[model samples]
Target chain A: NTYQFKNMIQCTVPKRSWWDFADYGCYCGRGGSGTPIDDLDRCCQVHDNCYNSAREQGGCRPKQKTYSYECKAGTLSCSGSNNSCAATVCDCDRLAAICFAGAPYNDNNYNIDLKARCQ
Target chain B: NRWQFKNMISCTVPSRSWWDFADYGCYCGRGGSGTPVDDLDRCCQVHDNCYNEAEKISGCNPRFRTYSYECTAGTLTCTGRNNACAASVCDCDRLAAICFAGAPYNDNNYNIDLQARCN
Candidate 1:
C-alpha cells in the first residue's frame, strides 16, 4: 500500500559535495577521473608548469647551448631561464671559433703552437 | 768587335742546377708562365722529409693513436672544423628521430604545458 501524499525514500535531487575530484584522485563516476599525475607535465595551468624554454617555435635544437633545453618528439628546444633566448649562452662546441687572425702585432704571444694556422 | 760580343752574349743560354726546372722538364709549356708550386711529386718528397724530422724528434716513438673513418661528401661535410654540415648515420634509435618526441614539445605559443591535455 502507498500513500499519494508520501514521497519516495530518495529524492530525485542529485547529490552534491564540495570536493576536488581530480586533485584528490576521486572517482566521480564513469567519466570522472579528474586529472592525472602523468598529465601534469603537459598542463600549462599555473600549477602545471612544463615549458621548454629553449627550443624555437617548432623543431629540435640543431645545436646545443649552455642554457637548459628540452627535446620533444625528434626536435630539440633550447632556452634561457633568466635571460632572453638571444642573450643565452651557447654550448662549448657551438661557440664562435677564436680566429687566429694576424695577432695584435704581438711578437711574443707564444703559449699555443699547434697548427698556428690550420688543422 | 763590341757588336759581335754583344750579339754572342745575347744568344748564350742560361745554366741551371740538376734540381732546377730543367731537371724534370718542369719548364715545359703548360700554357702558363708562373712556376706551378702544385708539384705533387716534389711536395711528397718534402712531406717525407717532414715526417722523418717528426719521427726523429719523437725518437721513433709509435703514434699514441691513429684513427680513420670514411666520410662521404655532400652527405657529410664539416664546417667549423669539428662541426659537420651534414652528419650521416647517427648512432641512435631512428624512430625517436622524429621531430615530436621530447619536451619543449615544440609548442611556440607555450599555451599548453606538458601536463596539459592536448584535447
Candidate 2:
C-alpha cells in the first residue's frame, strides 16, 4: 500500500525496486511528508546520485516547486502530473475575469454612451 | 453633503440636479446602495425614465452586475468605468496561472525529462 500524505502518494515502498520508487515522485514510505524525516529519507534515498555528484550530504531533496504548495481541506485543487493542491490558478471564475480584463482594444468606452438609452 | 455607503456616494441631494446624481451611476447619495431602500430611491429618481418605460416601480434599480460582488475587508478589487470593487478577477497571480494552463501546445511534457539535472 502507498503511504499517503495530503492525498498524495508521498512515500511508497514498492514491491522490490526500493530506490526506483524513492527515485521517482518522492516515494519513500517514511511518514511526515515534507517534514525533516521525509527530507532525511529523501537525502538518504538519493545516495547514489549524490555519490555521482560527490556531495557530502547527497544534495538535499527539496520539494518540487510547482506543486509544492500546501492545501487545506475542501478547497479546490489543481492537479499536475504527480500532484494536486489548492492554488489560486485553479479558481475558474478568477480565470475568466482576468481574461476579460486584457481587452487589447480597451473597455469599449465608445459603447458606454448607450447607457443613456433605456434598456 | 454626500452620503456614503460601501464607498459609493449614495443619496446626494446635489443642488439643482438633485435627481441627476440619482440618474447616473446610481449616484443618488442614497443610503444602502444595493438595498430595497436604495432601490426605492432609485425607483423614485428614475420616475421620468420609468414613465417612458411605462413600468410601475422603475424596473427596481438593481446594482450594476459587473462589479456587483460583495467583498471582505482586504481582498483585491476590479475597477471599471465608474465603479470598482473586490473581485477575484483582480487577483493577478491567479490570472498568470490560468494563462499558463491553456498552453495550446501542452505542458511541454518533453521538457520534464530534464528534471533529472541538479538545480
Candidate 3:
C-alpha cells in the first residue's frame, strides 16, 4: 500500500515583463563625441563602465573571454573562467551582449553614419 | 519663418515584454544527455542551432568576435565585424547572452548539478 500527500503545491510558471532598450551612448565604437547615438551605443558605454569598476573595486583582471551555459538543479549559469575576477569580467560582457541583442539595429543607420564618421 | 504641421504624432515610449527563459536543453555544454537541465542550457542549444543555420544559409564567416555598440538616428546597433557573416554570428551570440542574463540562476541548483554531471 502507498500513501500520497493531498495538499501538494504545484510549480507555477514565471511571468516576464517586456524588455525596453532605452539607454543611449557610444563607448567602444568610433565617432560619437561622447554622445549616445542610440541604445546600442549606450550598451557599450555601460559595459565600459562595468569593466572599469570591476577592475578598480571588484579586483577583476578583466580579460576578454567567451561565455558558456550550464544548469544546476533548475537554475542556469553562464560562465567563462573559473576565477572570481574572470566571472566579474564575464558578467559585464554578458550584460553587454544582452543589451546588444535587445537593441534595435534596423531602426537606424548607425552603421552607415559611424562608418562615415570614421572615414 | 518655417511652418510645421501641428497634428503630428508624437514619439511614444516603446515597451518591451519581460524576457522569459523557459526552454531547456544541453547543446554546447557537456552532460544532460540531450535533456534540458534548465533554461540556461536551453539557451546554449538555441545558440548552437542559430550558428549552424547561419553557417549553412546565411553565408556567415562564423568567427568568434567581441561586440560593440553604435547608434543611427535614434536606433541602437550592436555589431562586431564589417561583414554580414559576422553580423549573423554576432546576432547568435547576442541572443544567447540575453537568454543567459534572464535565466534564473539563483532559483535552482543547475550549476551544481551540471557540474556534477560533467565530472
Candidate 4:
C-alpha cells in the first residue's frame, strides 16, 4: 500500500481524477511499471509521475461520469402557440470526450510499490 | 495556460543530495527490437530525456449530472422532482501541480493563467 523507493519510471498523469495523492505512478524497485507501462502505443508519456511512498497508493484510475440529459424551456415572450422550443442535451459530453488520454487501466503489473496493488 | 513537464528527480535518501534536473532528453536513441528492455540502466543511461510528448489540456471543466423521469408529469402525484444540473466542481489541481513540479514550466502561475487567459 506504500512505496519507499527513490528511482521510478516517470509517466504521464491524465485528466479529472479524484486522487488524494498528487502524482499517478509507482516505485521502481517495488514491482511493475516495466511491462504494463509499455503496452499502449503512446499513453505512458504523461509527466505528473509522483511516487506516493508514505501512503503507498498509485494507479491509473480515470474519472468516470455517466452521460445524462436535461430538457428545459427558453424564457422569452417570443412564443406564439409553441413558436418557442426547448432543448435537451447530454451533460457529460466533455467528460466522455477526453477520457481516452491516459494509461487506461493496464492489465499487466506496473507501479507495484506505488499502488494498492493492481495488475 | 500551458505547462512544460520537467523531469524531477528529488533528494536521495540514505545518500545523494538534492535531486538534480535530468538532462533535457533523448540524444543517442533507438534500441534494437526488445521486450521490457533493461538496457537503459544497463548503460541505457540515456539520461531522463527520452520520454513522451509534452502535452497540455484543461485539468477540469464544469461537471454536471442530470436525472429525469416522467410519471406522466401532472398525472400520478408528479412534481418532476427536478433535475440536478449545475457545476458540482471545477477542477484545477494540476494547475498548481505542474507549477510546483521541478522548475516552473509555464511563464506564469496557473491561477494567473486561468484568471487572465480563461477568465
Which candidate's lDDT is highest? 3
TM-score of 1: 0.14
**DockQ (CA atoms), all models:** 0.01, 0.01, 0.02, 0.02
Q: Is candidate 2 or candidate 4 better by TM-score?
A: 4
TM-score for chain A in each prediction? 0.18, 0.16, 0.51, 0.18
Order by TM-score, highest first? 3, 4, 2, 1
> Least lDDT summed over 10 consecutive residues: which range in candidate 4 chain A?
A1-10
lDDT of 2: 0.24
User: Which candidate achieves the best TM-score against the true structure?
Assistant: 3
The 10 consecutive residues of candidate 1 chain A with the worst lDDT sum are A1-10
TM-score attained by chain A of model 4: 0.18
- How many residue pairs clash in model 4? 11
Candidate 1 CAPRI level: incorrect
For DockQ, candidate 2 versus 4, the one ahead is 4
- Ranking of predictions according to lDDT: 3, 2, 1, 4
Ranking by DockQ: 3, 4, 2, 1
Residues B1-119, model 1: lDDT tens digits? 11221122222212221111111111111111123223422332332333334333222211111212222321222223221211111111111111111212111322111113211
- TM-score of every model versus the real structure: 0.14, 0.16, 0.30, 0.17
User: CA lDDT of each candidate?
Assistant: 0.20, 0.24, 0.40, 0.20
RMSD of model 4 against the true structure: 24.8
Candidate 4 structure quality by residue, lDDT tens digits, A37-112: 3323122222112211201212211222112222223111211222111110111111111222333544243212
Clashing pairs in 2: A11-A28, B10-B29, B10-B30, B11-B28, B11-B29, B11-B30, B12-B28, B12-B29
Q: Report the lDDT of model 4 for residue A62.
A: 20
